[PDB]
Design an enzyme around this catalytic site. Structure first.
Site, PDB file in Angstrom:
ATOM      1  N   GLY B  29      63.278 -77.350 108.092  1.00 46.72           N
ATOM      2  CA  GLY B  29      64.508 -77.860 108.703  1.00 46.72           C
ATOM      3  C   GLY B  29      64.205 -78.769 109.863  1.00 46.72           C
ATOM      4  O   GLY B  29      63.226 -79.510 109.833  1.00 46.72           O
ATOM      5  N   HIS B  47      54.204 -79.196 104.926  1.00 45.79           N
ATOM      6  CA  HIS B  47      54.970 -80.385 104.617  1.00 45.79           C
ATOM      7  C   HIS B  47      55.108 -81.302 105.844  1.00 45.79           C
ATOM      8  O   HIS B  47      54.898 -82.517 105.780  1.00 45.79           O
ATOM      9  CB  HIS B  47      56.335 -79.924 104.087  1.00 45.79           C
ATOM     10  CG  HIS B  47      57.258 -81.035 103.714  1.00 45.79           C
ATOM     11  ND1 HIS B  47      58.456 -81.242 104.360  1.00 45.79           N
ATOM     12  CD2 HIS B  47      57.168 -81.990 102.758  1.00 45.79           C
ATOM     13  CE1 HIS B  47      59.070 -82.280 103.819  1.00 45.79           C
ATOM     14  NE2 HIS B  47      58.312 -82.751 102.847  1.00 45.79           N
ATOM     15  N   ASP B  89      56.664 -84.470  99.494  1.00 45.31           N
ATOM     16  CA  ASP B  89      57.912 -83.813  99.139  1.00 45.31           C
ATOM     17  C   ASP B  89      57.747 -82.967  97.890  1.00 45.31           C
ATOM     18  O   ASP B  89      58.233 -81.850  97.826  1.00 45.31           O
ATOM     19  CB  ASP B  89      59.030 -84.833  98.948  1.00 45.31           C
ATOM     20  CG  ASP B  89      59.485 -85.430 100.248  1.00 45.31           C
ATOM     21  OD1 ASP B  89      59.055 -84.941 101.327  1.00 45.31           O
ATOM     22  OD2 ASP B  89      60.232 -86.428 100.196  1.00 45.31           O
TER      23      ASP B  89
END
Lengths: 121, 121
Positions: B29, B47, B89
């Site tokens: 997030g 990530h 991603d």
């Protein structure tokens, strides 16, 4: 910063800010702006316009001081950007609370491609 | 962009990406990294580290092409940065899916301020 924003939203609305406003309508959340779906969404629209007017500090990242006094958000910054940022966030939190009465879950996780392009701020 | 990323997460995981991973643990997030709370969270950690090697492109905003081929994410030729972005991603969507078995709703909306500082990538 987003941490103060989330906190204020929680404080004003009593709602989980990520759950309720992390993706709501065309304007509340990670994606840019769009024509608002409802009053709640318009709050987020105004907020994004508020942020986009700011200079001198990073709205997402920069922490600032505020207090919760007589259940009011009181922005505790002299510094023009952080103060303005604080007030942007306070305003959206208040706006969101004000409009809880028309909050509609069906706008949660709204698909961006269903949104008209937002007017210029 | 977050659009491609969310779509990949949905595709791999079958979960509403905003709901499950828009605010999970210390890393999934908003904003930066923190010491991961579990495997799912570590995916998001990796990530965000992955995003650091990107130079000529914006992970949040820049669109790129990929396709779903035999139920795998296949990144389009793209330029170097977008290719690597796509692969960052893809990797997180895959990782999130791999770690669904220990996904813990208690970490959904984790209080990110309370996260330890992340180690260097």
């Amino acid at each position: 910063s987003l941490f103060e924003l989330g906190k204020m939203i929680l404080q004003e609305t009593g709602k989980n800010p990520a759950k309720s406003y992390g993706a709501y309508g065309c304007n509340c959340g990670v994606l840019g702006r769009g024509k608002p779906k409802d009053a709640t969404d318009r709050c987020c629209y105004v907020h994004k316009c508020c942020y986009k007017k700011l200079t001198g500090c990073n709205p997402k990242k920069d922490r600032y001081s505020y207090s919760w006094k007589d259940k009011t958000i009181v922005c505790g910054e002299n510094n023009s950007c952080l103060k303005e940022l604080c007030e942007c966030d306070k305003a959206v939190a208040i706006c969101l609370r004000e409009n809880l009465n028309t909050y509609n879950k069906k706008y949660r996780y709204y698909l961006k491609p269903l949104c008209k392009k937002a007017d210029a701020c």
